[PDB]
Amino acid sequence: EPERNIIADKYDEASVLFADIVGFTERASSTAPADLVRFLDRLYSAFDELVDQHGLEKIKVSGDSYMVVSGVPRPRPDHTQALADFALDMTNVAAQLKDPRGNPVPLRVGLATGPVVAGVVGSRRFRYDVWGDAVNVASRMESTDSVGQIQVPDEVYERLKDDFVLRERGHINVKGKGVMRTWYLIGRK
């Protein structure tokens, strides 16, 4: 049954992360849906542990993705930095796990900051959900990410540049809109 909206509110500013493990479908890998589910549950349980250790908020999403949010529902003035630190731990932890073949986990991570909408949605049962501008951006940062990096837009770079190390990935000129630039979040300063 499709979910429906119940209540929502706009938040001026929050930070949103998406992560996934790309190419772990039965189609792509031939691994049985049950073995996939077990290996993913391990990886996602590791991320669950990091979310709790960091005091952040996991948003139950449908689909392959893992979603984490900072400064929504409850604001914190370091929301971007806190999600960056969590993102770094998430990719550094995943880098110590391997698939069953002993190959690196093909993790993608995108991270964005900006307005969002949050509230309650549900079908039979309900859950807290977050969507809108920064979620859209985070989603695109994750789905065009190079595997093993953390991709972020300019807005995140402006907010983090003094305290983390970032390297520019590239830019594209879109006439007549403007320039689209993204960065890799590499580490802490």
Author numbering: 237 to 425
Would you copy out the relevant sentences from the publication that reported this structure?
Rv1625c is one of 16 adenylyl cyclases encoded in the genome of Mycobacterium tuberculosis. Adenylyl cyclases convert ATP to cyclic AMP, and these enzymes are classified into six types based on their sequence similarity. In solution Rv1625c exists predominantly as a monomer, with a small amount of dimer. It has been shown previously that the monomer is active and the dimeric fraction is inactive.
